[PDB]
Amino acid sequence: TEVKVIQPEKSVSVAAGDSTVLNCTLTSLLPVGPIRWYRGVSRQLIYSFTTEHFPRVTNVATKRSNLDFSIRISNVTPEDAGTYYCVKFQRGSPDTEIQSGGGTEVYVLA
Amino acid sequence: XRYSAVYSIHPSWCG
């Protein structure tokens, strides 16, 4: 019954200059630990979340949005093509990766 | 840079 990292799209096609969304959701925020996005597996860190939250009042959350770790790439360039993994870690000294999504490949059109 | 989170519930950062 451990946490699952869900990347629903095996691939996304995007025109250069357009924006795209890489979807990732988790079934839980536990155990505490960041969610990070990598290109490749070698791999390149591109985005990171904590499971902490901003004060709720400054949001103008839901069960689903609290678990949505999707990222956007704006103004896509050919060098954005590749496979992107959403990865959940347990917090520690140091953190250890516990689960990875299945990868989403980004196809960039001219 | 050109990377952002869809949701702003959890603090997040590129890199």
Where along chain A do its domains lie? 4-110
Strand pairing class (A104-109; A11-15): parallel
Beta bridge partners of A71: A22, B5
Chain A residues close to B7, C-beta within 8 Å: 65, 68, 70
Token readout for A49 is 């979340």
Distance from C-alpha of A68 to C-alpha of A87, rounded to nearest angstrom? 13
Q: Which of B7, B11, B15 sits opposite A65 (nearest CB)?
A: B7
Please, are residues A102 and A7 in contact by the beta-carbon 8 Å criterion? yes
Distance from C-alpha of A52 to C-alpha of A60, rounded to nearest angstrom? 18
Residue B14: closest C-alpha in chain A: A47
How many angstroms away from the CA of B8 is the closest CA of chain A?
Answer: 8
Please, are residues A7 and A103 in contact by the beta-carbon 8 Å criterion? yes
Please, are residues A100 and A5 in contact by the beta-carbon 8 Å criterion? yes
Q: How many CB atoms lie within 10 A of CB B4?
A: 15
Contact A54 B14 (CB under 8 A): no
Distance from C-alpha of A1 to C-alpha of A30, rounded to nearest angstrom? 12
Residue A108, helix vs strand vs coil = strand
Resolution, rounded to a tenth of an Å? Answer: 1.4
Q: Which amino acid belongs to residue A77? A: T
Distance from C-alpha of A89 to C-alpha of A100, rounded to nearest angstrom? 9
CATH of domain A4-110: 2.60.40.10
Experimental method: X-ray
